[PDB]
Amino acid sequence: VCGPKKSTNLVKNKCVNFNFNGLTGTGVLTESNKKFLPFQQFGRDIADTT
Amino acid sequence: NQKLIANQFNSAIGKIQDSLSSTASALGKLQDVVNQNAQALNTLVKQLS
């Protein structure tokens, strides 16, 4: 259940201000080899950051 | 006794190598410093959660 907000295109390997399903932060988005299981949407670090 | 002394010295050094190469605990005083600092930083980061 998400609000009336249009999406934008995604840009890789550049510093961007991102918003994924309401989750925000700043960082570089890159391709990964992290095998998320089908039920997993977000991953976390030791600091509980994304 | 110069020959004896030199031989005892040379043997003693070889023993140092055998000890250091096999006893990990030999360097515990330095390993402990590394561990305490690593623990301090890991604790600090975990507090962010």
PDB file of N, CA and C in Angstrom:
ATOM      1  N   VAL A   1       0.844  -1.189   0.000  1.00  0.00           N
ATOM      2  CA  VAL A   1       0.000   0.000   0.000  1.00  0.00           C
ATOM      3  C   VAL A   1       0.879   1.238   0.000  1.00  0.00           C
ATOM      4  N   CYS A   2       1.087   1.872  -1.175  1.00  0.00           N
ATOM      5  CA  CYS A   2       1.992   3.033  -1.294  1.00  0.00           C
ATOM      6  C   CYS A   2       1.266   4.270  -1.800  1.00  0.00           C
ATOM      7  N   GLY A   3       1.795   5.458  -1.457  1.00  0.00           N
ATOM      8  CA  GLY A   3       1.158   6.739  -1.761  1.00  0.00           C
ATOM      9  C   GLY A   3       1.245   7.130  -3.231  1.00  0.00           C
ATOM     10  N   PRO A   4       0.597   8.236  -3.597  1.00  0.00           N
ATOM     11  CA  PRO A   4       0.457   8.772  -4.931  1.00  0.00           C
ATOM     12  C   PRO A   4       1.705   9.512  -5.349  1.00  0.00           C
ATOM     13  N   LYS A   5       2.812   8.797  -5.421  1.00  0.00           N
ATOM     14  CA  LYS A   5       4.068   9.424  -5.769  1.00  0.00           C
ATOM     15  C   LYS A   5       4.693   8.702  -6.941  1.00  0.00           C
ATOM     16  N   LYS A   6       5.053   9.462  -7.960  1.00  0.00           N
ATOM     17  CA  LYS A   6       5.619   8.887  -9.161  1.00  0.00           C
ATOM     18  C   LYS A   6       7.048   8.462  -8.927  1.00  0.00           C
ATOM     19  N   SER A   7       7.426   7.358  -9.546  1.00  0.00           N
ATOM     20  CA  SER A   7       8.789   6.887  -9.478  1.00  0.00           C
ATOM     21  C   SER A   7       9.647   7.594 -10.507  1.00  0.00           C
ATOM     22  N   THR A   8      10.947   7.446 -10.352  1.00  0.00           N
ATOM     23  CA  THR A   8      11.927   7.979 -11.278  1.00  0.00           C
ATOM     24  C   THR A   8      12.770   6.829 -11.777  1.00  0.00           C
ATOM     25  N   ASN A   9      13.642   7.095 -12.737  1.00  0.00           N
ATOM     26  CA  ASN A   9      14.552   6.067 -13.216  1.00  0.00           C
ATOM     27  C   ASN A   9      15.655   5.879 -12.195  1.00  0.00           C
ATOM     28  N   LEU A  10      16.288   4.716 -12.202  1.00  0.00           N
ATOM     29  CA  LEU A  10      17.363   4.463 -11.258  1.00  0.00           C
ATOM     30  C   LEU A  10      18.725   4.597 -11.913  1.00  0.00           C
ATOM     31  N   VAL A  11      19.617   5.306 -11.235  1.00  0.00           N
ATOM     32  CA  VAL A  11      20.954   5.550 -11.740  1.00  0.00           C
ATOM     33  C   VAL A  11      22.004   4.840 -10.906  1.00  0.00           C
ATOM     34  N   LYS A  12      22.797   3.996 -11.551  1.00  0.00           N
ATOM     35  CA  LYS A  12      23.799   3.217 -10.837  1.00  0.00           C
ATOM     36  C   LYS A  12      25.180   3.845 -10.872  1.00  0.00           C
ATOM     37  N   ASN A  13      25.963   3.500  -9.856  1.00  0.00           N
ATOM     38  CA  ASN A  13      27.361   3.886  -9.691  1.00  0.00           C
ATOM     39  C   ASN A  13      27.565   5.393  -9.587  1.00  0.00           C
ATOM     40  N   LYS A  14      26.578   6.093  -9.050  1.00  0.00           N
ATOM     41  CA  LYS A  14      26.678   7.524  -8.832  1.00  0.00           C
ATOM     42  C   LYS A  14      26.080   7.835  -7.463  1.00  0.00           C
ATOM     43  N   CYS A  15      26.570   8.902  -6.798  1.00  0.00           N
ATOM     44  CA  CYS A  15      26.009   9.322  -5.505  1.00  0.00           C
ATOM     45  C   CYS A  15      24.632   9.957  -5.717  1.00  0.00           C
ATOM     46  N   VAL A  16      23.598   9.316  -5.125  1.00  0.00           N
ATOM     47  CA  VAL A  16      22.204   9.745  -5.247  1.00  0.00           C
ATOM     48  C   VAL A  16      21.476   9.776  -3.912  1.00  0.00           C
ATOM     49  N   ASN A  17      20.391  10.535  -3.881  1.00  0.00           N
ATOM     50  CA  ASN A  17      19.503  10.597  -2.727  1.00  0.00           C
ATOM     51  C   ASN A  17      18.334   9.663  -2.998  1.00  0.00           C
ATOM     52  N   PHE A  18      18.316   8.500  -2.372  1.00  0.00           N
ATOM     53  CA  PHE A  18      17.325   7.501  -2.748  1.00  0.00           C
ATOM     54  C   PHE A  18      16.155   7.386  -1.791  1.00  0.00           C
ATOM     55  N   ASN A  19      15.058   6.862  -2.328  1.00  0.00           N
ATOM     56  CA  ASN A  19      13.845   6.553  -1.591  1.00  0.00           C
ATOM     57  C   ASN A  19      13.230   5.250  -2.086  1.00  0.00           C
ATOM     58  N   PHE A  20      13.382   4.181  -1.319  1.00  0.00           N
ATOM     59  CA  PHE A  20      12.825   2.895  -1.712  1.00  0.00           C
ATOM     60  C   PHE A  20      11.665   2.540  -0.807  1.00  0.00           C
ATOM     61  N   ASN A  21      10.456   2.616  -1.330  1.00  0.00           N
ATOM     62  CA  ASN A  21       9.262   2.330  -0.545  1.00  0.00           C
ATOM     63  C   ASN A  21       9.184   3.156   0.739  1.00  0.00           C
ATOM     64  N   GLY A  22       9.607   4.413   0.697  1.00  0.00           N
ATOM     65  CA  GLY A  22       9.539   5.258   1.879  1.00  0.00           C
ATOM     66  C   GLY A  22      10.832   5.252   2.698  1.00  0.00           C
ATOM     67  N   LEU A  23      11.762   4.347   2.379  1.00  0.00           N
ATOM     68  CA  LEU A  23      13.041   4.273   3.080  1.00  0.00           C
ATOM     69  C   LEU A  23      14.067   5.139   2.395  1.00  0.00           C
ATOM     70  N   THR A  24      14.572   6.133   3.102  1.00  0.00           N
ATOM     71  CA  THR A  24      15.469   7.068   2.463  1.00  0.00           C
ATOM     72  C   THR A  24      16.877   7.026   3.003  1.00  0.00           C
ATOM     73  N   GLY A  25      17.783   7.584   2.215  1.00  0.00           N
ATOM     74  CA  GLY A  25      19.180   7.724   2.583  1.00  0.00           C
ATOM     75  C   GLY A  25      19.990   8.200   1.392  1.00  0.00           C
ATOM     76  N   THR A  26      21.279   8.398   1.601  1.00  0.00           N
ATOM     77  CA  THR A  26      22.155   8.856   0.537  1.00  0.00           C
ATOM     78  C   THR A  26      23.277   7.863   0.350  1.00  0.00           C
ATOM     79  N   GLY A  27      23.565   7.531  -0.893  1.00  0.00           N
ATOM     80  CA  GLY A  27      24.631   6.584  -1.165  1.00  0.00           C
ATOM     81  C   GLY A  27      24.690   6.203  -2.622  1.00  0.00           C
ATOM     82  N   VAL A  28      25.684   5.405  -2.950  1.00  0.00           N
ATOM     83  CA  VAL A  28      25.882   4.921  -4.294  1.00  0.00           C
ATOM     84  C   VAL A  28      25.233   3.558  -4.448  1.00  0.00           C
ATOM     85  N   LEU A  29      24.380   3.423  -5.452  1.00  0.00           N
ATOM     86  CA  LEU A  29      23.665   2.182  -5.707  1.00  0.00           C
ATOM     87  C   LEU A  29      24.402   1.374  -6.759  1.00  0.00           C
ATOM     88  N   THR A  30      24.815   0.163  -6.418  1.00  0.00           N
ATOM     89  CA  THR A  30      25.572  -0.648  -7.365  1.00  0.00           C
ATOM     90  C   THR A  30      24.959  -2.026  -7.522  1.00  0.00           C
ATOM     91  N   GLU A  31      25.392  -2.755  -8.540  1.00  0.00           N
ATOM     92  CA  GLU A  31      24.940  -4.128  -8.710  1.00  0.00           C
ATOM     93  C   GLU A  31      25.551  -4.960  -7.605  1.00  0.00           C
ATOM     94  N   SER A  32      24.878  -6.034  -7.210  1.00  0.00           N
ATOM     95  CA  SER A  32      25.390  -6.840  -6.113  1.00  0.00           C
ATOM     96  C   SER A  32      25.241  -8.319  -6.365  1.00  0.00           C
ATOM     97  N   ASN A  33      25.938  -9.090  -5.551  1.00  0.00           N
ATOM     98  CA  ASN A  33      25.866 -10.535  -5.572  1.00  0.00           C
ATOM     99  C   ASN A  33      25.269 -11.058  -4.272  1.00  0.00           C
ATOM    100  N   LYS A  34      24.445 -10.236  -3.627  1.00  0.00           N
ATOM    101  CA  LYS A  34      23.825 -10.636  -2.380  1.00  0.00           C
ATOM    102  C   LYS A  34      22.519 -11.341  -2.654  1.00  0.00           C
ATOM    103  N   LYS A  35      22.490 -12.614  -2.320  1.00  0.00           N
ATOM    104  CA  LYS A  35      21.344 -13.433  -2.638  1.00  0.00           C
ATOM    105  C   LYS A  35      20.259 -13.289  -1.605  1.00  0.00           C
ATOM    106  N   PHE A  36      19.392 -12.322  -1.819  1.00  0.00           N
ATOM    107  CA  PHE A  36      18.276 -12.147  -0.917  1.00  0.00           C
ATOM    108  C   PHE A  36      17.327 -13.288  -1.144  1.00  0.00           C
ATOM    109  N   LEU A  37      16.708 -13.762  -0.083  1.00  0.00           N
ATOM    110  CA  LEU A  37      15.710 -14.789  -0.237  1.00  0.00           C
ATOM    111  C   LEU A  37      14.456 -14.073  -0.712  1.00  0.00           C
ATOM    112  N   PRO A  38      13.542 -14.736  -1.422  1.00  0.00           N
ATOM    113  CA  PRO A  38      12.331 -14.175  -2.006  1.00  0.00           C
ATOM    114  C   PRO A  38      11.456 -13.370  -1.044  1.00  0.00           C
ATOM    115  N   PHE A  39      11.551 -13.644   0.252  1.00  0.00           N
ATOM    116  CA  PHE A  39      10.721 -12.935   1.216  1.00  0.00           C
ATOM    117  C   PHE A  39      11.407 -11.695   1.787  1.00  0.00           C
ATOM    118  N   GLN A  40      12.697 -11.535   1.484  1.00  0.00           N
ATOM    119  CA  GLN A  40      13.500 -10.455   2.037  1.00  0.00           C
ATOM    120  C   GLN A  40      13.496  -9.246   1.134  1.00  0.00           C
ATOM    121  N   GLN A  41      13.284  -8.090   1.728  1.00  0.00           N
ATOM    122  CA  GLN A  41      13.205  -6.852   0.958  1.00  0.00           C
ATOM    123  C   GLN A  41      14.363  -5.909   1.221  1.00  0.00           C
ATOM    124  N   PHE A  42      14.849  -5.912   2.449  1.00  0.00           N
ATOM    125  CA  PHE A  42      15.913  -5.016   2.857  1.00  0.00           C
ATOM    126  C   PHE A  42      16.998  -5.823   3.534  1.00  0.00           C
ATOM    127  N   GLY A  43      18.242  -5.387   3.414  1.00  0.00           N
ATOM    128  CA  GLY A  43      19.334  -5.976   4.177  1.00  0.00           C
ATOM    129  C   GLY A  43      19.843  -4.959   5.180  1.00  0.00           C
ATOM    130  N   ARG A  44      20.510  -5.418   6.233  1.00  0.00           N
ATOM    131  CA  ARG A  44      21.044  -4.485   7.225  1.00  0.00           C
ATOM    132  C   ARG A  44      22.464  -4.785   7.668  1.00  0.00           C
ATOM    133  N   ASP A  45      23.145  -3.722   8.074  1.00  0.00           N
ATOM    134  CA  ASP A  45      24.498  -3.760   8.603  1.00  0.00           C
ATOM    135  C   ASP A  45      24.478  -3.836  10.133  1.00  0.00           C
ATOM    136  N   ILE A  46      25.651  -3.867  10.744  1.00  0.00           N
ATOM    137  CA  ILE A  46      25.797  -3.980  12.193  1.00  0.00           C
ATOM    138  C   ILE A  46      25.145  -2.805  12.911  1.00  0.00           C
ATOM    139  N   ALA A  47      25.239  -1.628  12.311  1.00  0.00           N
ATOM    140  CA  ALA A  47      24.693  -0.395  12.872  1.00  0.00           C
ATOM    141  C   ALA A  47      23.184  -0.277  12.643  1.00  0.00           C
ATOM    142  N   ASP A  48      22.576  -1.300  12.040  1.00  0.00           N
ATOM    143  CA  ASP A  48      21.149  -1.333  11.717  1.00  0.00           C
ATOM    144  C   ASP A  48      20.818  -0.421  10.545  1.00  0.00           C
ATOM    145  N   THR A  49      21.848   0.056   9.864  1.00  0.00           N
ATOM    146  CA  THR A  49      21.654   0.868   8.681  1.00  0.00           C
ATOM    147  C   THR A  49      21.401  -0.048   7.505  1.00  0.00           C
ATOM    148  N   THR A  50      20.852   0.493   6.433  1.00  0.00           N
ATOM    149  CA  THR A  50      20.563  -0.333   5.278  1.00  0.00           C
ATOM    150  C   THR A  50      21.841  -0.709   4.548  1.00  0.00           C
TER     151      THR A  50
ATOM    152  N   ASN B   1      86.095 -20.201  27.389  1.00  0.00           N
ATOM    153  CA  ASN B   1      84.868 -20.876  27.023  1.00  0.00           C
ATOM    154  C   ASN B   1      84.172 -20.216  25.841  1.00  0.00           C
ATOM    155  N   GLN B   2      84.894 -19.473  25.013  1.00  0.00           N
ATOM    156  CA  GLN B   2      84.227 -18.751  23.935  1.00  0.00           C
ATOM    157  C   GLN B   2      83.435 -19.644  23.004  1.00  0.00           C
ATOM    158  N   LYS B   3      83.942 -20.830  22.699  1.00  0.00           N
ATOM    159  CA  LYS B   3      83.211 -21.705  21.793  1.00  0.00           C
ATOM    160  C   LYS B   3      81.926 -22.188  22.434  1.00  0.00           C
ATOM    161  N   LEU B   4      81.979 -22.477  23.726  1.00  0.00           N
ATOM    162  CA  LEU B   4      80.805 -22.940  24.440  1.00  0.00           C
ATOM    163  C   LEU B   4      79.752 -21.863  24.490  1.00  0.00           C
ATOM    164  N   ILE B   5      80.181 -20.655  24.797  1.00  0.00           N
ATOM    165  CA  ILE B   5      79.283 -19.532  24.925  1.00  0.00           C
ATOM    166  C   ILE B   5      78.625 -19.209  23.607  1.00  0.00           C
ATOM    167  N   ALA B   6      79.399 -19.182  22.532  1.00  0.00           N
ATOM    168  CA  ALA B   6      78.822 -18.916  21.232  1.00  0.00           C
ATOM    169  C   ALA B   6      77.827 -20.002  20.852  1.00  0.00           C
ATOM    170  N   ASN B   7      78.133 -21.261  21.169  1.00  0.00           N
ATOM    171  CA  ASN B   7      77.224 -22.348  20.836  1.00  0.00           C
ATOM    172  C   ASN B   7      75.949 -22.289  21.653  1.00  0.00           C
ATOM    173  N   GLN B   8      76.053 -21.924  22.927  1.00  0.00           N
ATOM    174  CA  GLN B   8      74.863 -21.811  23.750  1.00  0.00           C
ATOM    175  C   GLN B   8      73.997 -20.667  23.270  1.00  0.00           C
ATOM    176  N   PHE B   9      74.624 -19.566  22.882  1.00  0.00           N
ATOM    177  CA  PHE B   9      73.885 -18.433  22.366  1.00  0.00           C
ATOM    178  C   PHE B   9      73.142 -18.805  21.103  1.00  0.00           C
ATOM    179  N   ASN B  10      73.839 -19.450  20.177  1.00  0.00           N
ATOM    180  CA  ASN B  10      73.253 -19.796  18.899  1.00  0.00           C
ATOM    181  C   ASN B  10      72.089 -20.758  19.080  1.00  0.00           C
ATOM    182  N   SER B  11      72.218 -21.674  20.034  1.00  0.00           N
ATOM    183  CA  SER B  11      71.158 -22.625  20.310  1.00  0.00           C
ATOM    184  C   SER B  11      69.968 -21.930  20.942  1.00  0.00           C
ATOM    185  N   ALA B  12      70.231 -20.990  21.844  1.00  0.00           N
ATOM    186  CA  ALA B  12      69.163 -20.266  22.507  1.00  0.00           C
ATOM    187  C   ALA B  12      68.323 -19.498  21.506  1.00  0.00           C
ATOM    188  N   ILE B  13      68.953 -18.904  20.500  1.00  0.00           N
ATOM    189  CA  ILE B  13      68.175 -18.176  19.511  1.00  0.00           C
ATOM    190  C   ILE B  13      67.288 -19.134  18.734  1.00  0.00           C
ATOM    191  N   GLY B  14      67.816 -20.289  18.351  1.00  0.00           N
ATOM    192  CA  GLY B  14      66.994 -21.260  17.641  1.00  0.00           C
ATOM    193  C   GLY B  14      65.765 -21.642  18.466  1.00  0.00           C
ATOM    194  N   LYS B  15      65.929 -21.720  19.781  1.00  0.00           N
ATOM    195  CA  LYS B  15      64.810 -22.042  20.653  1.00  0.00           C
ATOM    196  C   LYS B  15      63.760 -20.939  20.638  1.00  0.00           C
ATOM    197  N   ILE B  16      64.190 -19.687  20.497  1.00  0.00           N
ATOM    198  CA  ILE B  16      63.256 -18.571  20.454  1.00  0.00           C
ATOM    199  C   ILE B  16      62.358 -18.722  19.251  1.00  0.00           C
ATOM    200  N   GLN B  17      62.949 -19.095  18.126  1.00  0.00           N
ATOM    201  CA  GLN B  17      62.164 -19.256  16.916  1.00  0.00           C
ATOM    202  C   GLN B  17      61.151 -20.373  17.048  1.00  0.00           C
ATOM    203  N   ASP B  18      61.548 -21.481  17.663  1.00  0.00           N
ATOM    204  CA  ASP B  18      60.633 -22.599  17.806  1.00  0.00           C
ATOM    205  C   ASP B  18      59.465 -22.247  18.704  1.00  0.00           C
ATOM    206  N   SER B  19      59.727 -21.464  19.744  1.00  0.00           N
ATOM    207  CA  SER B  19      58.664 -21.039  20.634  1.00  0.00           C
ATOM    208  C   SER B  19      57.711 -20.085  19.932  1.00  0.00           C
ATOM    209  N   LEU B  20      58.248 -19.059  19.287  1.00  0.00           N
ATOM    210  CA  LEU B  20      57.397 -18.060  18.658  1.00  0.00           C
ATOM    211  C   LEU B  20      56.596 -18.635  17.508  1.00  0.00           C
ATOM    212  N   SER B  21      57.165 -19.606  16.805  1.00  0.00           N
ATOM    213  CA  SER B  21      56.516 -20.203  15.649  1.00  0.00           C
ATOM    214  C   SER B  21      55.401 -21.177  16.019  1.00  0.00           C
ATOM    215  N   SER B  22      55.327 -21.588  17.286  1.00  0.00           N
ATOM    216  CA  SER B  22      54.357 -22.610  17.671  1.00  0.00           C
ATOM    217  C   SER B  22      53.404 -22.178  18.780  1.00  0.00           C
ATOM    218  N   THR B  23      53.795 -21.187  19.575  1.00  0.00           N
ATOM    219  CA  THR B  23      52.976 -20.766  20.699  1.00  0.00           C
ATOM    220  C   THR B  23      52.295 -19.440  20.393  1.00  0.00           C
ATOM    221  N   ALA B  24      51.020 -19.506  20.024  1.00  0.00           N
ATOM    222  CA  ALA B  24      50.284 -18.306  19.628  1.00  0.00           C
ATOM    223  C   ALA B  24      50.174 -17.333  20.790  1.00  0.00           C
ATOM    224  N   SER B  25      50.046 -17.886  21.992  1.00  0.00           N
ATOM    225  CA  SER B  25      49.878 -17.117  23.217  1.00  0.00           C
ATOM    226  C   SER B  25      51.112 -16.294  23.552  1.00  0.00           C
ATOM    227  N   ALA B  26      52.217 -16.556  22.861  1.00  0.00           N
ATOM    228  CA  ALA B  26      53.462 -15.860  23.115  1.00  0.00           C
ATOM    229  C   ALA B  26      53.292 -14.367  22.924  1.00  0.00           C
ATOM    230  N   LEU B  27      52.420 -13.966  22.000  1.00  0.00           N
ATOM    231  CA  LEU B  27      52.233 -12.554  21.701  1.00  0.00           C
ATOM    232  C   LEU B  27      50.932 -12.024  22.276  1.00  0.00           C
ATOM    233  N   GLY B  28      50.410 -12.693  23.298  1.00  0.00           N
ATOM    234  CA  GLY B  28      49.138 -12.311  23.896  1.00  0.00           C
ATOM    235  C   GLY B  28      49.098 -10.859  24.351  1.00  0.00           C
ATOM    236  N   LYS B  29      50.215 -10.316  24.812  1.00  0.00           N
ATOM    237  CA  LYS B  29      50.210  -8.926  25.254  1.00  0.00           C
ATOM    238  C   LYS B  29      49.909  -7.941  24.133  1.00  0.00           C
ATOM    239  N   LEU B  30      50.252  -8.282  22.894  1.00  0.00           N
ATOM    240  CA  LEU B  30      49.981  -7.375  21.786  1.00  0.00           C
ATOM    241  C   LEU B  30      48.643  -7.697  21.153  1.00  0.00           C
ATOM    242  N   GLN B  31      48.282  -8.970  21.159  1.00  0.00           N
ATOM    243  CA  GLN B  31      47.021  -9.395  20.581  1.00  0.00           C
ATOM    244  C   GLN B  31      45.873  -8.858  21.413  1.00  0.00           C
ATOM    245  N   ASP B  32      46.083  -8.778  22.723  1.00  0.00           N
ATOM    246  CA  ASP B  32      45.075  -8.280  23.641  1.00  0.00           C
ATOM    247  C   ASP B  32      44.785  -6.809  23.414  1.00  0.00           C
ATOM    248  N   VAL B  33      45.794  -6.038  23.037  1.00  0.00           N
ATOM    249  CA  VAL B  33      45.578  -4.625  22.792  1.00  0.00           C
ATOM    250  C   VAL B  33      44.702  -4.468  21.575  1.00  0.00           C
ATOM    251  N   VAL B  34      45.000  -5.249  20.550  1.00  0.00           N
ATOM    252  CA  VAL B  34      44.220  -5.214  19.336  1.00  0.00           C
ATOM    253  C   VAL B  34      42.784  -5.609  19.623  1.00  0.00           C
ATOM    254  N   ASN B  35      42.599  -6.649  20.430  1.00  0.00           N
ATOM    255  CA  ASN B  35      41.263  -7.105  20.747  1.00  0.00           C
ATOM    256  C   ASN B  35      40.477  -6.093  21.563  1.00  0.00           C
ATOM    257  N   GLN B  36      41.115  -5.421  22.517  1.00  0.00           N
ATOM    258  CA  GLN B  36      40.381  -4.448  23.311  1.00  0.00           C
ATOM    259  C   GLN B  36      39.914  -3.279  22.470  1.00  0.00           C
ATOM    260  N   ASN B  37      40.736  -2.854  21.523  1.00  0.00           N
ATOM    261  CA  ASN B  37      40.355  -1.726  20.698  1.00  0.00           C
ATOM    262  C   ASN B  37      39.283  -2.122  19.703  1.00  0.00           C
ATOM    263  N   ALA B  38      39.364  -3.339  19.180  1.00  0.00           N
ATOM    264  CA  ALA B  38      38.352  -3.822  18.267  1.00  0.00           C
ATOM    265  C   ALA B  38      37.020  -3.944  18.978  1.00  0.00           C
ATOM    266  N   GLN B  39      37.057  -4.397  20.227  1.00  0.00           N
ATOM    267  CA  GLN B  39      35.839  -4.544  20.997  1.00  0.00           C
ATOM    268  C   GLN B  39      35.230  -3.189  21.292  1.00  0.00           C
ATOM    269  N   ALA B  40      36.068  -2.199  21.583  1.00  0.00           N
ATOM    270  CA  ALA B  40      35.570  -0.868  21.877  1.00  0.00           C
ATOM    271  C   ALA B  40      34.859  -0.269  20.677  1.00  0.00           C
ATOM    272  N   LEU B  41      35.412  -0.460  19.483  1.00  0.00           N
ATOM    273  CA  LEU B  41      34.775   0.072  18.291  1.00  0.00           C
ATOM    274  C   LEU B  41      33.529  -0.695  17.925  1.00  0.00           C
ATOM    275  N   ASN B  42      33.538  -2.007  18.111  1.00  0.00           N
ATOM    276  CA  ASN B  42      32.358  -2.774  17.767  1.00  0.00           C
ATOM    277  C   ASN B  42      31.217  -2.408  18.687  1.00  0.00           C
ATOM    278  N   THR B  43      31.531  -2.130  19.943  1.00  0.00           N
ATOM    279  CA  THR B  43      30.511  -1.742  20.895  1.00  0.00           C
ATOM    280  C   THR B  43      29.930  -0.404  20.492  1.00  0.00           C
ATOM    281  N   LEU B  44      30.798   0.527  20.110  1.00  0.00           N
ATOM    282  CA  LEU B  44      30.361   1.852  19.721  1.00  0.00           C
ATOM    283  C   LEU B  44      29.429   1.789  18.518  1.00  0.00           C
ATOM    284  N   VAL B  45      29.771   0.986  17.523  1.00  0.00           N
ATOM    285  CA  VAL B  45      28.926   0.874  16.345  1.00  0.00           C
ATOM    286  C   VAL B  45      27.594   0.218  16.655  1.00  0.00           C
ATOM    287  N   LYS B  46      27.606  -0.837  17.451  1.00  0.00           N
ATOM    288  CA  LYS B  46      26.365  -1.502  17.796  1.00  0.00           C
ATOM    289  C   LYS B  46      25.405  -0.576  18.517  1.00  0.00           C
ATOM    290  N   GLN B  47      25.911   0.390  19.279  1.00  0.00           N
ATOM    291  CA  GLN B  47      25.028   1.314  19.989  1.00  0.00           C
ATOM    292  C   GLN B  47      24.148   2.130  19.060  1.00  0.00           C
ATOM    293  N   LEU B  48      24.508   2.231  17.794  1.00  0.00           N
ATOM    294  CA  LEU B  48      23.703   2.989  16.857  1.00  0.00           C
ATOM    295  C   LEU B  48      22.362   2.318  16.616  1.00  0.00           C
ATOM    296  N   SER B  49      22.279   1.022  16.904  1.00  0.00           N
ATOM    297  CA  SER B  49      21.053   0.259  16.701  1.00  0.00           C
ATOM    298  C   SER B  49      20.076   0.425  17.855  1.00  0.00           C
TER     299      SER B  49
END
